[PDB]
Amino acid sequence: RLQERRGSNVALMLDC
Amino acid sequence: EMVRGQVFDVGPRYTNLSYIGEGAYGMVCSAYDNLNKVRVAIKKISPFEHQTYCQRTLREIKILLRFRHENIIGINDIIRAPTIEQMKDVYIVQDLMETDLYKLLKCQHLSNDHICYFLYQILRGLKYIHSANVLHRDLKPSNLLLNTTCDLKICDFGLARVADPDHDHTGFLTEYVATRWYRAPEIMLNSKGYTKSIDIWSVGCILAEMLSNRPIFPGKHYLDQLNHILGILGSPSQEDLNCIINLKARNYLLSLPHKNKVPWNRLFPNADSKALDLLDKMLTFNPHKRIEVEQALAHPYLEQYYDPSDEPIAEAPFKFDMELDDLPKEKLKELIFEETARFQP
């Protein structure tokens, strides 16, 4: 995931 | 092979046909790719009787086939009949995406972390599009597809044009679009001569919308649209009026009542200050002062994601746009036949 790659750990979730 | 109404014969390779949410080209279904063994998205097209449906179908295909980027939807396959004569429909197969920013903005309050990461991906993809010398021209929430892990992809290049100096026609405003809420002010003021900056304006509108879950400039027509814009930005300065070359448009602006700028922090009191500073640079009335995609990515608001060592650009920029207006549909159906050839046995 591009996000992991950037070192971001924040679990970004979607509700819909 | 059974979606509300007609033949959705995506052959033997694709089965388990479910019905999905509308795009712009027609009926869209989800399906199982018995070859790659994964669920995909499939769009049925039938534009051969209409010059403009053909133009858009050809543009979308010529461009998407030549783009390859993590934040840009790709074309996995194209299903069409054996001979130019039997070809009436066209099925475009792409990666299945869970939802889009339009749906998400209707149901979820986006944390600043979500906003930051969505905006970064939109710009990373845009950087590639613009590096190819292409203008998307119709960025909006429904054109921003997302998976369950927040990976974002820009789609629908039917209205995109190569920024070809040697030619650019009038009539873009008159095109049918589902919404004009994301169109830059120059599109309503000058008849052409639009630059890459119209895409940065659209992104600014999308960022604003992520900050409050409401469109920032929801006009009910061109005149109303410009009024919403001027109601927040304020009347253009004499300096800004210089970017409007059209006589009637310039006279129209000088006939409008003076309006003060509404501070961004008044419209968005709970937003991150850096996001607002960036929003301000993207929603700049004068196209030439508007921030560029590369400067946008370098903005402090996106510091945790900026990484020019991992932000691909097109190796080869398109230098010429295609004469598709002076071309009868028969020659378009034709070209569409050639471009989809690479997927036939």
PDB file of N, CA and C in Angstrom, chain A:
ATOM      1  N   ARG A   1       0.859  -1.223   0.000  1.00  0.00           N
ATOM      2  CA  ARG A   1       0.000   0.000   0.000  1.00  0.00           C
ATOM      3  C   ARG A   1       0.881   1.254   0.000  1.00  0.00           C
ATOM      4  N   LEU A   2       0.626   2.165  -0.937  1.00  0.00           N
ATOM      5  CA  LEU A   2       1.382   3.414  -1.040  1.00  0.00           C
ATOM      6  C   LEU A   2       1.552   4.056   0.335  1.00  0.00           C
ATOM      7  N   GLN A   3       0.510   3.957   1.162  1.00  0.00           N
ATOM      8  CA  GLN A   3       0.528   4.526   2.507  1.00  0.00           C
ATOM      9  C   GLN A   3       1.563   3.861   3.417  1.00  0.00           C
ATOM     10  N   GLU A   4       1.649   2.537   3.384  1.00  0.00           N
ATOM     11  CA  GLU A   4       2.614   1.836   4.232  1.00  0.00           C
ATOM     12  C   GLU A   4       3.994   2.265   3.787  1.00  0.00           C
ATOM     13  N   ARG A   5       4.173   2.263   2.473  1.00  0.00           N
ATOM     14  CA  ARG A   5       5.411   2.652   1.816  1.00  0.00           C
ATOM     15  C   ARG A   5       5.914   3.994   2.364  1.00  0.00           C
ATOM     16  N   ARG A   6       4.992   4.925   2.588  1.00  0.00           N
ATOM     17  CA  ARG A   6       5.350   6.253   3.095  1.00  0.00           C
ATOM     18  C   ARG A   6       5.544   6.252   4.611  1.00  0.00           C
ATOM     19  N   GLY A   7       5.389   5.078   5.217  1.00  0.00           N
ATOM     20  CA  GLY A   7       5.562   4.949   6.652  1.00  0.00           C
ATOM     21  C   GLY A   7       4.372   5.386   7.487  1.00  0.00           C
ATOM     22  N   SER A   8       3.202   5.517   6.864  1.00  0.00           N
ATOM     23  CA  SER A   8       2.016   5.925   7.607  1.00  0.00           C
ATOM     24  C   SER A   8       1.323   4.670   8.124  1.00  0.00           C
ATOM     25  N   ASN A   9       1.093   4.639   9.432  1.00  0.00           N
ATOM     26  CA  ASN A   9       0.474   3.500  10.108  1.00  0.00           C
ATOM     27  C   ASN A   9      -1.020   3.667  10.335  1.00  0.00           C
ATOM     28  N   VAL A  10      -1.470   4.918  10.341  1.00  0.00           N
ATOM     29  CA  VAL A  10      -2.869   5.239  10.562  1.00  0.00           C
ATOM     30  C   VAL A  10      -3.774   4.334   9.738  1.00  0.00           C
ATOM     31  N   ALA A  11      -4.618   3.575  10.430  1.00  0.00           N
ATOM     32  CA  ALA A  11      -5.543   2.659   9.776  1.00  0.00           C
ATOM     33  C   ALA A  11      -6.725   3.435   9.207  1.00  0.00           C
ATOM     34  N   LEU A  12      -6.615   3.843   7.950  1.00  0.00           N
ATOM     35  CA  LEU A  12      -7.677   4.610   7.314  1.00  0.00           C
ATOM     36  C   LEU A  12      -8.805   3.709   6.841  1.00  0.00           C
ATOM     37  N   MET A  13      -9.974   3.874   7.447  1.00  0.00           N
ATOM     38  CA  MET A  13     -11.121   3.061   7.080  1.00  0.00           C
ATOM     39  C   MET A  13     -12.213   3.829   6.361  1.00  0.00           C
ATOM     40  N   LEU A  14     -13.031   3.086   5.628  1.00  0.00           N
ATOM     41  CA  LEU A  14     -14.145   3.646   4.881  1.00  0.00           C
ATOM     42  C   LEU A  14     -15.411   3.045   5.465  1.00  0.00           C
ATOM     43  N   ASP A  15     -16.485   3.818   5.492  1.00  0.00           N
ATOM     44  CA  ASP A  15     -17.724   3.307   6.038  1.00  0.00           C
ATOM     45  C   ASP A  15     -18.713   2.959   4.937  1.00  0.00           C
ATOM     46  N   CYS A  16     -18.403   3.357   3.707  1.00  0.00           N
ATOM     47  CA  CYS A  16     -19.271   3.059   2.568  1.00  0.00           C
ATOM     48  C   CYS A  16     -18.485   3.129   1.264  1.00  0.00           C
TER      49      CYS A  16
END
